């Protein structure tokens, strides 16, 4: 048909997406801002739509019930047709490759350790070899799956640990996770994206550090439902963005930019 | 149709594709070694099709004649039917996502300077603000068009030195530019994709250096014609390939291992 308003699903998660401070006083797409705001300003021009951001209603990234096999968080706003794209941190996966379409990845990260600054881990096989330093991810996403589906020693040890681990070492947002760094003393340590940590280590009050080499290497994705008319218009702006150094200039502007802890 | 041998288009380029030592003593796929010779026997696999390893003809990686409008390289084998797959460190562009389809990338890379060591130059900056080094690119490839198309004000200033210099700066292949590099004293720099660049500083004689950040950051993709029905399960192969961890393990068997400068 004739085209329609896209409603665009996304996640609240710094610097992608955040309220402003004066939100209430907003109204619409005004209500937000970030990396991801920006990201989907450039994509609807150059793809030429009117859209809609709405935050997902559940607060997750995306994962499937192993028993009734039903989608939660953005993948799942997707799946059942309650969002027309999502443009997000979203993760790129096997699992959800399957379901849903993704564009070439606008940024790259990798599986990376959070800890309070003086925190005796320097790595992955660090934290695997001790136990008074707890340590977990975030639910219903795409870190948990990897710790979970891993056939890598480190990896399957580490698992094996923190499924089981009393109390809960998983977090519901990365805000939590990145609390609990803060307010345990060193005995909590926080797996997340690379991406996520880089931003938090330059934000007030800079008493967090990202250690070791990442643990993977991947990307995120603008992801669309299966056939959806946008994807192909969707990946070429993804990919016309990139070569102009506009996702280059964005990632200066709310990394960079936002740094609070000096050079 | 039933399913019908594979024919393969790549590019001699090390550590991707190289010729055996013993090659004249071999037939077919077996002449070949190399990440992109293993990668694509674990593609061919986990899509369950045979295949035959071809070297492009010309040598090239692929562009399109500005005049005629003739891709030539890898991206024209595929364009014109020769072959059915391109596995190979080809970079994924918006020219040629318009003509081929790519896979999510494979690995990751962004252009970066090579300079015979001791050379007195540590980013594009400093060879902007200067004559007495030469510097350039290969030519029918995507460093090439990325400084002609650059609207960004150093890159547009090497592009402008670049393409008038004389005598010229551009090389037919990598091995060319590294050989300037080796024999022209301090005074030629290369600009070529990092994991190359990477590779060949681990290499006997041990006397290059990559300096400085990448410029940009971008990937290599497995590349089908548009349509084709390989492009989706070999899409799946590669994301399963990647979180299997399988594509970690290559990098470190044609990298890591096959270092040569010590540690
Ligand atoms: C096995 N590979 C793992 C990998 C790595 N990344 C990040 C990445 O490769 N970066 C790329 S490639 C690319 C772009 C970017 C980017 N800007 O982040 C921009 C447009 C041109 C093509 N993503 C992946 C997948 C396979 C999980 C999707
Ligand atoms: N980007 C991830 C969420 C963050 C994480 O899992 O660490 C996903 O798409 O599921
Ligand atoms: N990977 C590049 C070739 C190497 C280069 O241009 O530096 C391409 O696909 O064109």
Redesign the interface.
Same mark, same amino acid.
């Given at each position: 048909g004739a085209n329609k308003t896209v409603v665009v699903t996304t996640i609240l998660e710094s610097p992608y997406v955040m309220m402003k401070k004066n939100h209430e006083m907003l109204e619409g797409n005004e209500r937000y801002e970030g990396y991801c705001v920006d990201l989907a300003a450039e994509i609807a021009k150059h793809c030429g739509f009117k859209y809609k951001l709405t935050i997902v209603g559940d607060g997750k990234y995306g994962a499937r019930d192993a028993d009734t096999k039903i989608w939660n968080g953005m993948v799942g706003e997707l799946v059942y047709g309650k969002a027309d794209i999502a443009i997000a941190p979203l993760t $790129?996966?096997?699992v959800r490759?399957?379901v849903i379409d993704?564009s =070439?990845?606008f940024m /790259?990260l990798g599986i990376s350790i959070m800890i309070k600054k003086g925190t005796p881990i320097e790595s992955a096989e660090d934290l695997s070899k001790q136990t008074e330093i707890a340590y977990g991810t975030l639910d219903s996403g795409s870190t948990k799956e990897?710790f979970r589906?891993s =056939? $890598?020693a480190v990896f399957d040890k580490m698992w094996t640990y923190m499924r089981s681990a009393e109390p809960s070492v998983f977090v519901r947002t990365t805000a939590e996770g990145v609390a609990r760094v803060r307010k345990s003393k060193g005995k909590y340590a926080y797996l997340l994206e690379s991406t996520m940590n880089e931003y938090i280590e330059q934000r007030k009050p800079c008493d967090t550090m990202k250690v070791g080499g990442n643990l993977? /290497?991947?990307?995120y994705g603008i992801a669309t439902p299966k056939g959806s008319s946008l994807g192909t218009p969707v990946?070429?702006a993804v990919?016309?963005l /990139?070569?102009?150094?506009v996702?280059?200039k964005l990632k200066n502007k709310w990394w960079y930019d936002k740094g609070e802890c000096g050079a």
């Open positions: $790129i996966t096997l490759e399957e993704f =070439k990845p /790259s990897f589906r =056939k $890598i993977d /290497s991947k990307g990946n070429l990919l016309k /990139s070569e102009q150094g996702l280059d």
